């Protein structure tokens, strides 16, 4: 199993710059690279990454995406003086050339291919390339928008040719539309391209009609190009997460890519002079995290744009933190996307509904300042495991088995006050472990999450929940797989209960989400539908301080690892899972996902039952006025 994160960088890519006056071009500067690397070094992140060297892309590699005529033309720019470079630059839009830019372009491209090789060879889990010049605007025969050669396009074409991959996802979260990537894979269903971008009704550069939501691809590629235009500036964390939960992720997990490549422009971050969006650097920690369960974690992040040197360094750090598996920061203040984003989201979902299952829409009808991000630190041990007495297991290197007298006195207090007749000395053991791991998770910063196997469900849950609330945990998200009633009160706003059950039951609290999924071959696709489109939107808005997972002993959850992995985007990754009864496999799967191991892909699934989609949309209707992040349409105004 692959481990580690590659960081691919070279100061040579900082050795070209703009050589004449041009206020529009002067934003793209060498310091973008140096500020990004130095931020990674300052925070100790570069030192934790494998420093794979850059190389030049070969001529044959450049020819995968560009014409001989265009390559030959750019190959002559090293020999040009400044007058000649300016004249060559004016043949293209929004791009400048320099004696060294052809050299650097070949390095930016080779760097990306090195990243692809390291990930696909399993030499690292994932990685990031800090490159100049950017790539995603460059085309078959044109430089465009500071881009010379299309780095991310090369990476997908190279991965197809040399690793015979059938499905590649490209996620372009730069604030500009990567039209060069769109054109490259327009007719290609093997490479799914997603882009959000500032558009403003085509008035924002590059001002293309085909950057709109209606470009879904051509021919066999129809449905494999997804454009999400932002028609207002000021988009927030909530808008970006709505885009992921209600557009990108449902398609990504159904597509089931074999490799994820990210066109990572951070000009979509707050403070950027080109993007003028309002999302915080912390959001990129979660954008990265939400994609990591795809392709067994094989993710290649490639730097595109980003022009506020402060915003840029912080967003690069948040991304690498997540690649290294550090705990995600808590996102507060989430709610509904704005109306213009909901309109863009509504429109993309509708035009894409002929290609993607979950999008169908009827029933039978169809100076800027922001706070510095907090420090993100991996816990001493990530995952504590407490299997039944007398069960020793092989644990991953960042897990550990679990009982002091302070703790022992507390279990005594709890028994005498709340369970008078309880004397099962094994239950009293679990209760001592529950309190002990929670104390390490919450107050100690030494442990991140934990799994405890339990026998008595009610006393275990009550002790876990009540003890967590006084840690203090202002809010606790409970995720319960099983039927029956739990000793959990959801009446004061401190607890949200997600219940995956088998019996259909009436929901009356807006602090509860009950999912009765019809048993069948389709339970997997429906659960993933609910996870990305219902559970995660509410969980992120709730913003809990702790997640409490509970699984009763009463087989069909080939979904648990994805849930465990994605739900660690909440509560800085602080999740306590209580498994009722010993299941060797479920315990090993739970520990593996809790500890940050890569997740096995889901592959293909029978599309969800209409009864399930109906049940889920009734939940969204019932909950979205309280929990606006659930909205994937514009509200109907009175
Ligand atoms: O790559 C980017 N971000 O990551 C990126 C790409 C393009 C631009 C805008 N831009 C930059 C020089 C320039 C010149 C003319 C025009 C023009 O023709 N305007 O109408 C536009 C221009 C900004 C950033
Ligand atoms: K984009
Ligand atoms: K495509
Ligand atoms: Zn950009």
Numbering used by the authors: 1 to 366, 399 to 434, 437 to 588, 593 to 676
From the paper:
Histone deacetylases (HDACs) regulate the acetylation state of lysine residues of histones as well as other protein substrates, and therefore play a pivotal role in many cellular processes. Specifically targeting two or more distinct HDACs can also be beneficial, but this presents a particular challenge when those two HDACs belong to different isozyme classes with different structural requirements for efficient binding (the Zn2+‐dependent HDACs are grouped into Class I (HDACs 1,2,3,8), Class IIa (HDACs 4,5,7,9), Class IIb (HDACs 6,10) and Class IV (HDAC11)). We report the synthesis and evaluation of a class of selective multitarget agents for the inhibition of HDAC6, HDAC8, and HDAC10. Hybridization of the two inhibitor structures resulted in dihydroxamic acids with benzyl‐indole and ‐indazole core motifs.
KGaAParallel to our biochemical evaluation, we attempted to co‐crystallize the dual inhibitors with Danio rerio (zebrafish) HDAC10,32 where we had introduced A24E and D94A substitutions to more closely resemble the human HDAC10 active site. However, due to the rigidity and bulk of 3a there are significant local structural changes in the active site. Specifically, the 310 helix containing the P23(E,A)CE motif that protrudes into the active site shifts, on average, by 1.4 Å (maximum shift=1.9 Å). However, the current structure reveals that this motif can shift to accommodate the binding of certain bulky inhibitors. Zinc coordination by the ionized hydroxamate group of 3a is achieved by a mixture of two different monodentate binding modes. The hydroxamate of the major conformer (67 % occupancy) coordinates to zinc through the N−O− group (O−Zn2+ separation=2.1 Å). At first glance, the hydroxamate group of the minor conformer of 3a (33 % occupancy) appears to coordinate to Zn2+ in a manner similar to that observed for bidentate hydroxamate‐zinc interactions as observed in other HDAC10‐inhibitor complexes. Thus, inner sphere Zn2+ coordination is achieved solely by the hydroxamate N−O−group (O−Zn2+ separation=2.4 Å). The phenyl ring of 3a makes favorable offset π stacking interactions in an aromatic crevice defined by F146 and W205, as well as the Zn2+ binding residue H176. The A24E substitution was made to “humanize” the active site of zebrafish HDAC10, so the packing interaction between E24 and the indole ring of 3a is presumably important for binding to human HDAC10.
